[PDB]
Design a protein around this motif. Sequence first.
Motif, mmCIF file in Angstrom:
data_model
loop_
_atom_site.group_PDB
_atom_site.id
_atom_site.type_symbol
_atom_site.label_atom_id
_atom_site.label_comp_id
_atom_site.label_asym_id
_atom_site.label_seq_id
_atom_site.Cartn_x
_atom_site.Cartn_y
_atom_site.Cartn_z
ATOM 1 N N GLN A 11 -2.554 11.272 4.934
ATOM 2 C CA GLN A 11 -3.028 10.597 6.755
ATOM 3 C C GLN A 11 -3.489 11.549 7.654
ATOM 4 O O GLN A 11 -3.782 11.346 8.802
ATOM 5 C CB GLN A 11 -1.605 9.548 6.767
ATOM 6 N N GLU A 62 -3.590 4.908 0.138
ATOM 7 C CA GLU A 62 -3.431 3.650 1.091
ATOM 8 C C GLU A 62 -4.592 3.478 1.405
ATOM 9 O O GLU A 62 -5.461 4.412 2.312
ATOM 10 C CB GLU A 62 -2.219 3.963 2.330
ATOM 11 N N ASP A 89 0.542 3.363 -1.596
ATOM 12 C CA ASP A 89 0.684 4.398 -0.915
ATOM 13 C C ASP A 89 2.015 4.627 -2.052
ATOM 14 O O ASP A 89 2.482 4.878 -2.966
ATOM 15 C CB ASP A 89 1.351 4.344 0.325
ATOM 16 N N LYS D 252 7.721 2.838 1.559
ATOM 17 C CA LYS D 252 8.050 4.599 2.063
ATOM 18 C C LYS D 252 9.501 4.132 2.314
ATOM 19 O O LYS D 252 10.484 5.246 2.451
ATOM 20 C CB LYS D 252 7.328 4.702 2.588
#
Lengths: 430, 430, 427, 427
Positions: A11, A62, A89, D252
């Motif tokens: 990102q 992602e 991700d 995450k």
Amino acid sequence: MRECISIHVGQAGVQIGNACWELYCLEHGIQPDGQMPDSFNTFFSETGAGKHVPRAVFVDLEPTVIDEVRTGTYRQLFHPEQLITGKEDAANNYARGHYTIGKEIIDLVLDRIRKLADQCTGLQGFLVFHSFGGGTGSGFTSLLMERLSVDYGKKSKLEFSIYPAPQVSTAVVEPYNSILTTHTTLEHSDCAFMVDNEAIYDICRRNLDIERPTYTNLNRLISQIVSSITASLRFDGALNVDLTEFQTNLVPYPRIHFPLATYAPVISAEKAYHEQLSVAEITNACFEPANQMVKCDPRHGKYMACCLLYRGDVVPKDVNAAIATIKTKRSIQFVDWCPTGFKVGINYQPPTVVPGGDLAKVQRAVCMLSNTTAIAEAWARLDHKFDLMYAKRAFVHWYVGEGMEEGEFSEAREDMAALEKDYEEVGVDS
Amino acid sequence: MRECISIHVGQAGVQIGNACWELYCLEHGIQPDGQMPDSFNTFFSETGAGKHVPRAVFVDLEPTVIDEVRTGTYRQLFHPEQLITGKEDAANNYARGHYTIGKEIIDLVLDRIRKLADQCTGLQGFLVFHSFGGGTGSGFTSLLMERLSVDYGKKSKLEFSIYPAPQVSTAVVEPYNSILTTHTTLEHSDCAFMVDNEAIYDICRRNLDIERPTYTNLNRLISQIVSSITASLRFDGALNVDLTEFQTNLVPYPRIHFPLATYAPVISAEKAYHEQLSVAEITNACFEPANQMVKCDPRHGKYMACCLLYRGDVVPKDVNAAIATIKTKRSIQFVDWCPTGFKVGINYQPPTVVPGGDLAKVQRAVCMLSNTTAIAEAWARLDHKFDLMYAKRAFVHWYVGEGMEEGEFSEAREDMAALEKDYEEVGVDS
Amino acid sequence: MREIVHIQAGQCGNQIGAKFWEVISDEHGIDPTGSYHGDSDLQLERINVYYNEAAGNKYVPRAILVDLEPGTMDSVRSGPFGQIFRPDNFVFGQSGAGNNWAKGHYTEGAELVDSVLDVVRKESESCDCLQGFQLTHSLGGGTGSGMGTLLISKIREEYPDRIMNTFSVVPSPKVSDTVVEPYNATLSVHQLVENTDETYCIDNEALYDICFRTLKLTTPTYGDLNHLVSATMSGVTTCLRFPGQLNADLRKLAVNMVPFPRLHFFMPGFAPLTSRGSQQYRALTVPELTQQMFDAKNMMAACDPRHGRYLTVAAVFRGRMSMKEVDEQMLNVQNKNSSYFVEWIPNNVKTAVCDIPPRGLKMSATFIGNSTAIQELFKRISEQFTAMFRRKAFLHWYTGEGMDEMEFTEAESNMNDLVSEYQQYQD
Amino acid sequence: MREIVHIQAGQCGNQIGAKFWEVISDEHGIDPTGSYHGDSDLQLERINVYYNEAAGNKYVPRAILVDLEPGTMDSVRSGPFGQIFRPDNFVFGQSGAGNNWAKGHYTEGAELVDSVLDVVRKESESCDCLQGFQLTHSLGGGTGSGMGTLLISKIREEYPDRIMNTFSVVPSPKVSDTVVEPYNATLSVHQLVENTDETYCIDNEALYDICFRTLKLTTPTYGDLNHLVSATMSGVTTCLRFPGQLNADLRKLAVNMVPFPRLHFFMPGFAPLTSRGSQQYRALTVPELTQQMFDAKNMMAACDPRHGRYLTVAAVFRGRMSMKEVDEQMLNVQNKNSSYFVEWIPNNVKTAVCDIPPRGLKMSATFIGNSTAIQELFKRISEQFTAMFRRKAFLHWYTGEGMDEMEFTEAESNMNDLVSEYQQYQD
Ligand SMILES: Nc1nc2c(ncn2[C@@H]2O[C@H](COP(=O)(O)CP(=O)(O)OP(=O)(O)O)[C@@H](O)[C@H]2O)c(=O)[nH]1
Ligand SMILES: Nc1nc2c(ncn2[C@@H]2O[C@H](COP(=O)(O)CP(=O)(O)OP(=O)(O)O)[C@@H](O)[C@H]2O)c(=O)[nH]1
Ligand SMILES: Nc1nc2c(ncn2[C@@H]2O[C@H](COP(=O)(O)OP(=O)(O)OP(=O)(O)O)[C@@H](O)[C@H]2O)c(=O)[nH]1
Ligand SMILES: Nc1nc2c(ncn2[C@@H]2O[C@H](COP(=O)(O)OP(=O)(O)OP(=O)(O)O)[C@@H](O)[C@H]2O)c(=O)[nH]1
Ligand SMILES: [Mg+2]
Ligand SMILES: [Mg+2]
Ligand SMILES: [Mg+2]
Ligand SMILES: [Mg+2]
């Protein structure tokens, strides 16, 4: 000829690449849809008639930010095969980004890089944009860089990374990934430029008096740094700096390739009028410990080699005067074995300003990239955090369950330790 | 002169022929009703005043597939004598199409071909379109090629096939028919091009980014390949490839006459804008495994002869440059007994675009035809399917229930075993 | 052109046939009086497969209406679309088989089979290029089971090269309506084994299970069950009646689903089958048709496919659909369920795709599957027959008019042999 | 693309899930009939994470509604937004657990759960790239606790590499609805220790306390509690459903908040929360969101964080926000309160920022905190269980349903081990 390929992983890498490509399109006059109503051949390939495609690649595990690019105002700039997207991700996991999730997408991005590299005839090297904190930006960046090393070989590899700040960080499992990615960046990289988000924040708060800056300002600053890096290759100047010359002048030893970038003058519009921004004073401001984009103290470090990239209305004589004044200052010291440690580059074209940006238009600008020992302290407290978290084996299972072992955790630890030992023994007097 | 006769047998052959004749009418300017509002003499014969009738023949054992042609847009392009329908479908039986149903329709197609061939004065040969899995496209094609070989003889017989896929298959008895038809296709076809439906689907999915491609897109690609093959006869260029020299360059041994077709660039409209469709890059894209029109990896095979049919805005010097770059690639391998393995033809006529088609308008296009050993494992897996179904004598009662014998199956299997041994002993080094 | 002669035997056969002609005339746009009022021209080039041309643009079915009780044909004629049939195709006696295979096959079937064969001879010689026959009957009664078996045999010596297609409702242990179901079912299977090219084993239990759990239908009458059977019957001949990307006539399905001549008992099905309230929430694509048509609850037989192995399956798809999606779905079904498919037959699926869908739906699929789960459906009948046969139960009826114990013994032996060979090829 | 399958178990789970689906359809602009009436394309660029594209340009939730009483099913269907759910996903029995974990986990829930597994299987196979499942259930009853625990075990067995989410409401000592709450809670927590990837400990005390002192709401019903839980559930996955400056999917958060596999019990929290009368007297800025998140009163488990040490903290921010001041606020929080954060983990707080705020607010934040103060929530449950276990109280129901006392003994041992490990990581 004289081309270079940009790679954006994670990102952070993708957003920094968005800022960089907006800046490049502004620089070369190319509209967001690719039409330009020469020197642009470095970063853009001309397709057919009136269509320029950037020599870039966008990689993520992602689909959020890549699809944001695919629906943004620059959707016509990139072809869809240039933006490569995963499904799940890496989730801040070096194991996931390197072994489990990175293995099924590496082949396609390498094929895209191959099809982008044979198109150009003078490929200077690669520009990999990533971050140490992210699982993708660590694991997949390491995997891609080792694949590039085994494939291309002698081609230069320059990478821009977002090193975690001593105090300002947004990931708990961050030090693991940061140690692991450097364990391979030590050998698969030719020059790794280092950036701390906290230092960008401090510069934005003080110099640009922005009370609430966000990631877009950070990416704009990094884009300005990369533009100043590549200006000597995308234009003409009194003194031209190429990537190979840059590596030769800046990297004294093969493992010591982690310079610190500073950029000046970075000031607001209202503060620019009262300042007579001369070459000497921006050169002095480059060495100011408050203007470094890495949260470290150059005073307790020792300079080894610095490259001064000037752009704008700059003549060599005032640059020599500024360098001579810098040498006479005792607060800035250099290693004994480097009697001359300044690589000078002057470019005629001034840095452009992105509309809506916080920076002000300046006649001159300097991007100094100094390889100094002040980053030994950065490596030192990153290693202390890594040890302090690894003593209890916290989060280790979240890596072990994905094709990974503790033995290479220990080997990355000792590789980092050898790195601080290397910096310490090259920083000593003879 | 230089006329060619197209024979379309079976449903697949008839539909591919519909696509081919739509493409040719678009290319030569022929309207669907047969009036032009020269170079069309290869495929169309002008009849009376302002009427062109194609040198085709449409034969199927069922009426319906011919029947949408008899009542469709191209009902007036043809006349009912080269549109031939039987009574009962072969029903995926090689035996039914070869013995029971073929025998009372073979004479009519034979004398229609006679009346279509005695009309022209420069007949190069025949184009036969079919599948191997279908009963008609195997059995009746075998019978028809028997008759054509015993009647015409030295005249060329180019063959287009839809090879059964390793996994994408729609007939249970498909391997039986495929093994049975090749036992005569070996000694009655001068050159046999292979197309596999699974590979064409995968190509449409990746390159042409169609989520849901039907048979009409498949036939569009096949028709584009056939048009690229026959453009040398139908137009003029720097280097022209006739069918005879085509066979001479492409067929090293009489049994080894099964080249693999491919086309480039196969791209969508939006992908064409951002692509630099140079000669070198399409030449490279021809050899990479993912655009092969048959599901087989050429990497673990070795090439024998490649026929590069360039068309559009192509000059010979960049073709030589692309071939030189190909020769230096270690991944692509050639047999030692072929020091030069590239027969190259360049045509000025660019590939046209069918209205409503998924293909984008391109300046250049390559139809590369490689005779390689990568078809050996496809035939080996077909043999594995065949003897798997044959160890239990499954479905054999249908074939032997009309007049076929077990010896037919045994001799077809040993013929394929010999042919596989032949490829193994011809691909070996010296 | 590839004509089909339709025969209906017994009350159940006539009901299902009347519903089948209802749905077919709906497909081809034929009014209740038999005249064309469709919109698409595709409804007429293949009108001869089921219909004959009458004077004055009138279409009459190629149907033979066979039963011993005249009330069944009275009901069929009096119902809707019932006057379309030819008046002299109606063939009837006066007694009724009386739930007796013996009287439906020997004593009052025989005097009527002469007339039935005369009618079917006239229909077959009238048609241009015959391809086969269709018979609808049930195995529980004596008219349906017995006389339909006799009729099938007679057609077989008269037309041995034409395809024999039958749609047979088999008895079920749960839905049991007559007491002598095992006898009639066993005696009928004894002849459907060697006299038919394909048999679609219908049963009332599975149809009721559909109308309960799939359609959420509160009170399913026989009309809905016959509607489902008619939908399957239309699906198996859509390729004959309409164009398509892949065309598959009856003979192609037969050759693609009969590895050995005796294993021609197929487990039919249909998709999509949706409740009125639930159809509004359902995506309608090829994958959902595939998952519905391969679901054990959707199947039209009282035998779980999961208890056996699929020898071959057929997916006669209808409507404008992509061939990649269809073939890929079949591929995924074959791969992720490799244990449920026979290993010595790669590519167990036969796929056909038509472009004209059933009225009111944009795509539909007819599942046909030759599985090894028919073995238990036949073992149920076999064990019921054995239970009723050790004690000579009800044998005095069948023996009263010509039958003997050895015929029952040979019928049971044949059914046991067929069960054993299904078990053998299941492995 | 990283889609989530939602399951509701029991009456509380069903109501919380219904409220969650209502608020998430409001967030994505889906009307109560299921069609899209939003304004921004961002409401549809990630619509597949929770909704299935049905025919007709409308959406149905990827939710399976599970209970053992049809009454809760009828209540959920009859309410607002209750028509959007697919009718076949409504899986229910007829008897009910009757506050018996045994009846919900061994006999009646076990009998019913096959249909639930079939429905979740077809949901997981219909979707493209599943990332995990989320379940909403109670711990005091037998339906929710027991049957959702069984469902979690089955799902983990079938999908061992997918992430489990459980927004589970735990019993509390003061607002104790039923008598057998600790039995049910201990039995559920047994398998929630290992079969769930992460669990959100919620309870009615903290929700009531929020509605009393924060929202200043005079008579809050279950609707406001369910709305709070729904808002937290939406804020957990807002990073999946919308873009942002820094994205963070559930995996995450799982890897950044679970240092050791058995420590995945979190206290959820939501900010901002202000009364109607105090809405105009409060400043719209991020530091006050941080203060509202990190104070003890906003926690949604009845655990005071001041009595424990934070292991890991998540803060999923929403809206157009600056990163510098967010990071500075988190740094100040970790600096002024170093005693309340675990010392061997630097950077105890993980920050995620999304750009799309919830409807009606331009800025919001979700607190997810993993702290050792959770251990006392298990201390109280364990001591209540031990009080009823020494005297064999209420055990005869579970024993007669098929359990044994040793199951209870080992469930208690498991909870005591978890408490001990939390204590010895608190130091
Ligand atoms: N699926 C259907 N099954 C039916 C229908 N009508 C009857 N049946 C079933 O058929 C079974 C017996 O078949 P029939 O009653 O038609 C007996 P048939 O007339 O063929 O012989 P006899 O009555 O002994 O002369 C029994 O289970 C009935 O419930 C129908 O319309 N649909
Ligand atoms: N926060 C909420 N708590 C609820 C809600 N409904 C019930 N509860 C609480 O949950 C606890 C009991 O949960 P349920 O009534 O759903 C028990 P369940 O139906 O899962 O099991 P059985 O009653 O054995 O069938 C108890 O403390 C209730 O007050 C609700 O909508 N929200
Ligand atoms: N300077 C700057 N840093 C960023 C930006 N976006 C993310 N980062 C940094 O990236 C780190 C995390 O990596 P990400 O790029 O967000 O995520 P990733 O690289 O895709 O890896 P994953 O965590 O697996 O998604 C954070 O610690 C941030 O400091 C940005 O726009 N500018
Ligand atoms: N590429 C392509 N292949 C087709 C098409 N139609 C049929 N096929 C292939 O043909 C094979 C079977 O042969 P068919 O063409 O369907 O039937 P046939 O050749 O008329 O012979 P019969 O079986 O007697 O009908 C199938 O495996 C299909 O892959 C088509 O339109 N395009
Ligand atoms: Mg990321
Ligand atoms: Mg055909
Ligand atoms: Mg009757
Ligand atoms: Mg309850």
